Design a protein around this ligand. Structure first.
Ligand SMILES: [Hg+2]
Ligand SMILES: [Hg+2]
Ligand SMILES: [Mg+2]
Length: 307
């Protein structure tokens, strides 16, 4: 079976999230969605740093063509942070756009660049709840002239994103739906259509909620299962096919990104936040970062955002 290693050097996170592997610098970036912090891990040098802001954060993605700059979320704003990767605060902040200026209790959540470099990200109520809570989120992409376009409404908890290698499909998770959806993706118009369920947790006795996800070069999706103590591997060739399960010690698995020199080491974030309606006692809920090897697949380098 695959080897699941707890990364001792990284400690515990309230809600570690948003992992991004920069392949040229062999560096993992990630966030804590509650603690208002960004994080960097350089595994080959065992180097860890953090960066503090005063707004809720949910993703960190290098800006294409601009070393030392990152596209991030700050509450409902998409912004460029100039950060040296080591100081405990950014050097400067350049706001790009507020996606929801008049929705005072919403926030951005998961986000990722499509393979063409367009940032896609969605929102949620800050006080969203599972299985049932306020449903106030939408899915966006950031297009030309720094304006966002909306693609879907009625999202409870805007979560993991991936695209097929042929650029014909997008995959998307609202954790409240307890399923992964697939869509036809038109790369020329940057629009999605024909939404349909790909994989439905209840049909496979999978507990918990889908959270972040990523795709491998064979086209399999790797999905974090929050309150399921696992990642799952699912088909994109046939609907409703569970290919494998890998248990992760932390129950609240949050997200996934392939890394390492050969793109074959799966980094897995988790959450130590202890929630009142948990299926797991507090002693189990820690928030470590893990690395999974031996999966027999390779992923893709993290894509930078183009502005
Ligand atoms: Hg930062
Ligand atoms: Hg940053
Ligand atoms: Mg998430």
């Amino acid at each position: 079976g695959p080897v699941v290693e707890k990364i001792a050097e990284l400690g515990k996170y309230t809600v570690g999230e948003g992992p991004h592997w920069d392949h040229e610098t062999q560096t993992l970036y990630f966030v804590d969605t509650v603690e208002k912090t960004f994080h960097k891990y350089v595994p080959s040098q065992k180097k860890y740093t953090f960066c503090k802001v005063d707004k809720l954060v949910s993703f960190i993605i290098p800006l294409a063509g601009s070393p030392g700059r990152f596209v991030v979320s700050l509450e409902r704003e998409i912004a460029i942070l100039t950060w040296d990767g080591v100081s405990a605060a950014p050097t400067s902040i350049e706001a790009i756009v507020n996606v929801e200026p008049h929705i005072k209790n919403n926030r951005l959540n998961d986000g990722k660049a499509d393979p063409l470099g367009n940032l896609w990200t969605g929102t949620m109520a800050i006080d969203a709840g599972l299985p049932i809570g306020p449903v106030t989120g939408s899915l966006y992409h950031l297009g030309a002239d720094k304006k966002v376009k909306m693609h879907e409404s009625n999202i409870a908890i805007a979560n993991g994103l991936a695209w097929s290698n042929d650029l014909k499909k997008m995959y998307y998770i609202d954790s409240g739906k307890r399923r992964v959806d697939e869509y036809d993706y038109d790369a020329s118009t940057l629009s999605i259509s024909n939404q349909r369920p790909l994989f439905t947790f209840e049909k496979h006795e999978v507990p918990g909620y889908p959270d972040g996800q990523t795709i491998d070069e064979e086209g399999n999706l790797w999905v974090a299962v929050f309150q399921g103590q696992r990642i799952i591997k699912i088909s994109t060739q046939q609907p409703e096919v569970l290919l494998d399960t890998v248990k992760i010690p932390d129950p609240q698995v949050t997200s996934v990104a392939f890394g390492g020199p050969n793109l074959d080491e799966l980094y897995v974030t988790s959450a130590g936040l202890q929630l009142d309606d948990s299926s797991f006692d507090k002693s189990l809920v820690n928030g470590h970062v893990y690395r999974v090897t031996g999966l027999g697949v390779k992923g893709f380098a993290g894509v930078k955002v183009k502005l």
